[PDB]
């Protein structure tokens, strides 16, 4: 499963954060800072895969804000990238032309979508339309 | 522009629709097409080439292009795939040996990007003997439930009896036409 | 800016 998934901007600002492992607040902040420094201090030809702390620290950002994932060394590396791409596509479909500004304003919506998509670091919705329909139904409830 | 003529034509019925006739040899595809066009069980020679016919039902002329299941005529179905909106697969539930060949032919026909807008049309042909399977065993064997992005429905139709052809035609019309 | 740009550009 994914130990922690956090969306950090190019400048270092974090737009998202979701850790599936219970860690201390100071320890979690230190881990996030180290991950940001590693991503911020990595080139574009590093394969987007980092083995930091025995965790598949996969960084792959399609825009100025980057995304990072931490999974155990028990599954394929391409699976994490595929899951990240599927989540990005689902978020773009739910929002519509998702940008950095919309992510900050839609932090609660993004957190709800992430919770409804992956829970506990594992994949919960394989389909892309069922999750979107469920999110829309939950939003329409009020 | 004005669409008064189009509205007038649609008021009394203007939609026609299309259909395809494909499947293994001796699977009742020619018999099914004859029943759809004429309505009788007429014995005919094997379709070396192809059979072209049209059936008018529900104010829609669903033309069906019958294609033989012969080895020399199996690869000729790609010629009719151009400008084709429907595709009907003829299954042979009484031919266990030819069931695999029919399934492979259906998979090859459905594995083409050109034939993507045509929904699956599987007819349980040879529904006159006890050896014929049900509407779920044939679909499970052919794997029609796993064909995503395709409207495939399993219908049992007997050429000798003619029952089930109306249900298949209605399903094809619903798949093609989605109006009131 | 660079923030208003689409994440995937779709």
């Amino acid at each position: 499963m994914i130990h922690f998934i956090l969306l950090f901007s190019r400048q270092g600002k974090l737009r998202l954060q979701k850790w599936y492992i219970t860690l201390p607040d100071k320890e979690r902040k230190k881990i996030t800072r180290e991950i940001v420094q590693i991503i911020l201090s990595r080139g574009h030809r590093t394969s987007s895969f980092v083995d930091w702390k025995e965790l598949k620290l996969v960084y792959k950002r399609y825009a100025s804000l980057y995304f990072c994932c931490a999974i155990e060394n028990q599954d394929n590396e391409l699976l994490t990238l595929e899951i990240v791409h599927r989540y990005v596509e689902l978020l773009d479909k739910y929002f519509g032309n998702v940008c950095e500004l919309d992510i900050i304003f839609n932090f609660e919506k993004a957190y709800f979508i992430l919770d409804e998509f992956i829970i506990g670091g594992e994949i919960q919705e394989t389909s892309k339309k069922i999750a979107v329909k469920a999110i829309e139904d939950s939003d329409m409830l009020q | 522009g004005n669409i008064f003529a189009n509205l007038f034509k649609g008021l009394f019925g203007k939609k026609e629709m299309r259909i395809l006739m494909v499947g293994l040899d001796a699977a009742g595809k020619t018999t099914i097409l004859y029943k759809l066009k004429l309505g009788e069980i007429v014995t005919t020679i094997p379709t070396i080439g192809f059979n072209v016919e049209t059936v008018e039902y529900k104010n829609i002329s669903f033309t069906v292009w019958d294609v033989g299941g012969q080895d020399k005529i199996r690869p000729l179905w790609r010629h009719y795939f151009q400008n084709t909106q429907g595709l009907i697969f003829v299954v042979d539930s009484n031919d266990r040996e030819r069931v695999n060949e029919a399934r492979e032919e259906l998979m090859r026909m459905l594995a083409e990007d050109e034939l993507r807008d045509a929904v699956l049309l599987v007819f349980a042909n040879k529904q006159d003997l006890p050896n014929a399977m049900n509407a779920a065993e044939i679909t499970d064997k052919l794997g029609l439930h796993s064909l995503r992005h395709r409207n495939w429905y399993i219908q049992a139709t007997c050429a000798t009896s003619g029952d089930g052809l109306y249900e298949g035609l209605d399903w094809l019309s619903n798949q093609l036409r989605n109006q009131k | 800016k660079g923030e208003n740009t689409s994440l995937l550009h779709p």
């Binding site: 990595r42 030809r45 590093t46 394969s47 987007s48 895969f49 980092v50 083995d51 599954d75 394929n76 590396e77 391409l78 699976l79 990238l81 595929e82 899951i83 791409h85 599927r86 596509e89 994949i123 394989t126 389909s127 892309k128 339309k129 069922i130 | 998979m107 594995a111 794997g143 439930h145 796993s146 064909l147 995503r148 992005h149 395709r150 | -």
Partner: protein, 200 residues
């Protein structure tokens, strides 16, 4: 199954059902829902491959039952996209971790070698990880990639360089140890500050 091995026998009876489900999923190569980049249900396929690799890892009946499915997936899957490459890597890992046939092992080795020559950093990292995992298993077949392992040490990727160094360390035997000693010393002398201690 991973938590305790008591349910492995109980969970191993569903191997034919899982094989049938995987075959049915592979039969439909398109997916309106969950089908991305031409791969339908990539998450389901990955889960099935992981279950097959973890199911019957030390049994012949389980490997034999899923041998046909693994062979079909190894040849009926296109690795042009990332999902296909991930599926192929998962199938190769499952074949290596299970008691598969000689042909399956040869196909997995060929796939790993082909992915090693890929210019993609992620593909190279995946190939290096697969080679490192398949170090003890198919060790003789892994010796054909000695040149690739040596070249990966000089690669401009930190992850790729680390994977190449790990593969070289795990591939050291009682006959290539003397020959590989000079290469290891050269790598340690001209290695990064974070890899000099690890190399030593």
């Amino acid at each position: 199954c991973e938590r305790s091995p008591d349910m492995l026998a109980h969970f191993r009876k569903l191997v034919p059902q899982l094989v049938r489900i995987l075959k049915n999923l592979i039969m439909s190569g398109y997916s309106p829902e969950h089908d991305v980049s031409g791969i339908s249900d990539p998450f389901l396929q990955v889960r099935i491959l992981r279950l097959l690799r973890i199911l019957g890892r030390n049994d012949d009946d389980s490997s034999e039952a899923m041998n046909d499915i693994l062979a079909q997936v190894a040849t009926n899957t296109e690795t042009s996209k990332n999902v296909g490459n991930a599926i192929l890597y998962e199938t190769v890992l499952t074949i290596m971790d299970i008691k598969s046939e000689s042909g399956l092992r040869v196909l997995a080795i060929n796939i790993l070698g082909r992915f090693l020559l890929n210019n993609d950093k992620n593909i190279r990292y995946v190939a290096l990880t697969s080679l490192l995992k398949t170090v003890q298993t198919d060790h003789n077949a892994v010796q054909r990639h000695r040149s690739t392992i040596v070249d990966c040490l000089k690669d401009l990727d930190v992850s790729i360089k680390r994977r190449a160094m790990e593969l070289s360390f795990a591939l050291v035997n009682g006959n290539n140890i003397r020959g590989m000693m000079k290469e290891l010393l050269y790598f340690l002398d001209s290695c990064e500050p974070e890899f000099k201690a690890d190399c030593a």
